[PDB]
Write a protein that binds this DNA or RNA. Sequence first.
DNA 1: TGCACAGGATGTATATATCTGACACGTGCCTGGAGACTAGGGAGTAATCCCCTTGGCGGTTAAAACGCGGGGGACAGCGCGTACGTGCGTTTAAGCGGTGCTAGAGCTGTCTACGACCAATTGAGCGGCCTCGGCACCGGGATTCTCCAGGGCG
Length: 66
Amino acid sequence: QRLVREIAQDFKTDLRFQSSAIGALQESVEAYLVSLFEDTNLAAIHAKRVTIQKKEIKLARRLRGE
DNA sequence: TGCACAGGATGTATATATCTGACACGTGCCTGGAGACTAGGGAGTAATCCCCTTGGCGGTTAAAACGCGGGGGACAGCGCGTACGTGCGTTTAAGCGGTGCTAGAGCTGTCTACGACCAATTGAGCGGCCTCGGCACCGGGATTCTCCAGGGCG
């Protein structure tokens, strides 16, 4: 909540957030980040180890078109 | 006899007339520009009510935060060999110049189904409600499932 409000502070001052639509942002963030951890996990498996590394997130990130 | 020369017999860049390709300029028929009528869709206001805040004490709990052991897994070093990198000659086949066709692509009347536009009914679908049987959470108990210590075995 305080994070979304923090991001909304410097955009439009004195806004209001409904009781809904926050669980949609958090839900999409969680569901997307889990898939990102799966693709990054596979990227770490391609290097033949059990550890996720900072370069793995960049590999699995940029390789998705970002 | 050994030798230099005067001129023909071939090359070769050099300069001139010649062949595509693309920019530049002059039209006239389907576009735009513009003028007037209708009107319903957009700008503006009057309550409203309704969930959303204001400010901060305490008490307590569950979650967040820190701290150390070490175990295993990331990771550097190094030798091997076979799997492509590199280099030849030999072949099959695309590029391209040119040809005879056609069958499907492409612009144009007819009318005729056939869907756009508009009254009248209603009933099937939406706001409101209030229950109970499926659901939430956990005990009881059996079951599996992994962790650690010999020891019989190297």
